[PDB]
């Protein structure tokens, strides 16, 4: 099952939080109505290149509702040290700095 990328803006509903596994859980609210759609999610150390680091734990993160302001959670496996959590694509993408150690 596949979906096209979500096109609208995301917002963090709360501070990203370390899980007991050392991973990071993130909850986002989605302003769009094109759901169901694929949530763009990655981590990077360099926002200019967006070269991926770490990986997404959540297999196929999706917004499942077609109504605005629905929420979803995703889990990320951040790299050693400092990185950025990057949700969404384009100019309206959101970022949050993360430190793992």
């Amino acid at each position: 099952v596949s979906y096209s990328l979500c096109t609208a803006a995301f917002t963090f509903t709360k501070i990203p939080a370390e899980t007991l596994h050392g991973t990071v859980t993130v909850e986002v609210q989605y302003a769009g109505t094109d759901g169901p759609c694929k949530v763009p999610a990655q981590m990077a150390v360099d926002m200019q290149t967006l070269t991926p680091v770490g990986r997404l734990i959540t297999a196929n993160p999706v917004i499942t509702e077609s109504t605005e302001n629905s929420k979803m959670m995703l889990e990320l496996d951040p790299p050693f040290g400092d990185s950025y959590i990057v949700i969404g694509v384009g100019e309206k993408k959101i970022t949050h700095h993360w430190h793992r150690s």
Partner: single-chain antibody
Framework: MDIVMSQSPSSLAVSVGEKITMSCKSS????????????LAWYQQKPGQSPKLLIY???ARDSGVPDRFTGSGSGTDFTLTISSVKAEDLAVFYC?????????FGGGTKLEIKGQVQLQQPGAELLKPGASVKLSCKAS????????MHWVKQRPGQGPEWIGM????????KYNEKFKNKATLTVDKSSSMVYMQLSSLTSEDSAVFYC?????????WGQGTSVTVS
């Protein structure tokens, strides 16, 4: 496992006005499923100049790049098309993957014709085997602190090699394993200066060393410092 970039043909001799195609193949897919982008760039290096970004995200043209340059392809197979060659296009064209660290470049296609951001680097050094040298990179025209500064090594007419990068604000670094004991990156935040110290110099180190802000719509290269080891 490092990604290997392969280009063909090694050289292309064409007359002005011809349409040409050149190929770039990666050993691993550069299509990142999370955001559906191809992390592939095309660089043009004219005589006497630093490499200049032409295409990023496999098909996005950088500002000022004419429509007659077209990047295409996806995954592991990419193509740069020049619809109508001009004499000024004479250059070596390099593809580069930025899907994974370390960044890697192809061996280049040499195009032969028959028919405010500043990164300032000093002039040539010449040194003896066993010595060390501290190369400098003076940055201006942008907010220095938050942009990664990369260092690149290029032997004559050969594929560039990504040495590593340093973030000035945090001092964080990422090194290519092949240079982890050869190069040391530091910054002087008070002077917007980036340094790369090369140790235990040998003739294998003789090359032009570039500092560069790499990637997408903010790609900028210094003029390079030529280092020759006796």
């Amino acid at each position: 496992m490092d990604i290997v970039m392969s280009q063909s043909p090694s050289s292309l001799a064409v007359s002005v006005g011809e349409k040409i195609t050149m190929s770039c193949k990666s050993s691993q897919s550069l299509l990142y499923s999370n955001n559906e982008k191809n992390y592939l760039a095309w660089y043009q290096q004219k005589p006497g100049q630093s490499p200049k970004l032409l295409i990023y995200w496999a098909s996005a043209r950088d500002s000022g790049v004419p429509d007659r340059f077209t990047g295409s392809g996806s995954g592991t197979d990419f193509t740069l098309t020049i619809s109508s060659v001009k004499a000024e296009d004479l250059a070596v064209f390099y593809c580069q993957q930025y899907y994974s660290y370390p960044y890697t470049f192809g061996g280049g296609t040499k195009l032969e014709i028959k028919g405010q951001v500043q990164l300032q680097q000093p002039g040539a050094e010449l040194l003896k085997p066993g010595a060390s040298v501290k190369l400098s990179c003076k940055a201006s025209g942008y907010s220095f602190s938050n942009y990664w500064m990369h260092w690149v090594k290029q032997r004559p007419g050969q594929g560039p090699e990504w040495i590593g990068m340093i973030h000035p604000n945090s001092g964080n670094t990422k090194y290519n394993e092949k240079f982890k004991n050869k190069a040391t990156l530091t910054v002087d935040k008070s002077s917007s200066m980036v340094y790369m110290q090369l140790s235990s110099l040998t003739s294998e180190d003789s090359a032009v060393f570039y500092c560069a802000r790499l990637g997408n719509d903010m790609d900028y290269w210094g003029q390079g410092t030529s280092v020759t080891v006796s």
